Curated annotation (Swiss-Prot), chain A:
Location relative to the cell: Virion; Host nucleus
Subunit annotation: Homomultimer. Makes the hexons and eleven out of twelve pentons. Interacts with triplex proteins 1/TRX1 and 2/TRX2; adjacent capsomers are linked together in groups of three by triplexes, heterotrimeric complexes composed of one molecule of TRX1 and two molecules of TRX2. Interacts with scaffold protein; this interaction allows efficient MCP transport to the host nucleus. Interacts with capsid vertex component 2/CVC2. Interacts with the small capsomere-interacting protein/SCP.
Gene coding for it: MCP
Protein name in UniProt: Major capsid protein
Signal peptide range: none
Role noted for this protein: Self-assembles to form an icosahedral capsid with a T=16 symmetry, about 200 nm in diameter, and consisting of 150 hexons and 12 pentons (total of 162 capsomers). Hexons form the edges and faces of the capsid and are each composed of six MCP molecules. In contrast, one penton is found at each of the 12 vertices. Eleven of the pentons are MCP pentamers, while the last vertex is occupied by the portal complex.
Family: Belongs to the herpesviridae major capsid protein family.
UniProtKB/Swiss-Prot annotation, chain B:
Ranges in coiled-coil conformation: none
Gene that this sequence comes from: MCP
Species of origin: Human herpesvirus 2 (strain HG52)
UniProt subcellular location: Virion; Host nucleus
Full-sequence range covered: 100 to 148 of 1374
Listed name of the protein: Major capsid protein
Domain of life: Viruses
Role description: Self-assembles to form an icosahedral capsid with a T=16 symmetry, about 200 nm in diameter, and consisting of 150 hexons and 12 pentons (total of 162 capsomers). Hexons form the edges and faces of the capsid and are each composed of six MCP molecules. In contrast, one penton is found at each of the 12 vertices. Eleven of the pentons are MCP pentamers, while the last vertex is occupied by the portal complex.
Record-stated family: Belongs to the herpesviridae major capsid protein family.
Subunit-level organization: Homomultimer. Makes the hexons and eleven out of twelve pentons. Interacts with triplex proteins 1/TRX1 and 2/TRX2; adjacent capsomers are linked together in groups of three by triplexes, heterotrimeric complexes composed of one molecule of TRX1 and two molecules of TRX2. Interacts with scaffold protein; this interaction allows efficient MCP transport to the host nucleus. Interacts with capsid vertex component 2/CVC2. Interacts with the small capsomere-interacting protein/SCP.
Length: 49, 49
């Protein structure tokens, strides 16, 4: 039961089977961006509000 | 100053009533209007250029 399996593990006994663990670390990195000379377009407009 | 055709006979005498009659001036509205949109307020002043 889920009740019995609560009651076996805190004591500590292997309950017939096992598990697997899936988790998520996260890493801030400093990347590097090479570019070719003429790639983008990026036009410009007008300024008023 | 109305005329007199002053009469013969003993019918009594004509009498010139050179009266001043008055009048009364009225008052009138004559109203007119015109729209102006939500734009052209910054325009025609010098804001949004």
């Amino acid at each position: 039961s889920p009740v019995a399996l609560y009651h076996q593990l805190k004591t500590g006994l292997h309950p017939g089977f096992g598990f697997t663990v899936v988790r998520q670390d996260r890493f801030v990195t400093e990347n590097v961006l090479f570019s070719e000379r003429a790639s983008e377009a990026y036009f410009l407009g007008q300024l008023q509000v | 100053h109305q005329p007199l055709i002053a009469r013969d006979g003993p019918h009594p005498v004509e009498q010139p009533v050179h009266n001043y009659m008055t009048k009364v001036i009225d008052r009138r509205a004559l109203n007119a209007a015109f729209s102006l949109a939500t734009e052209a307020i910054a325009l025609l002043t010098g804001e949004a250029l």
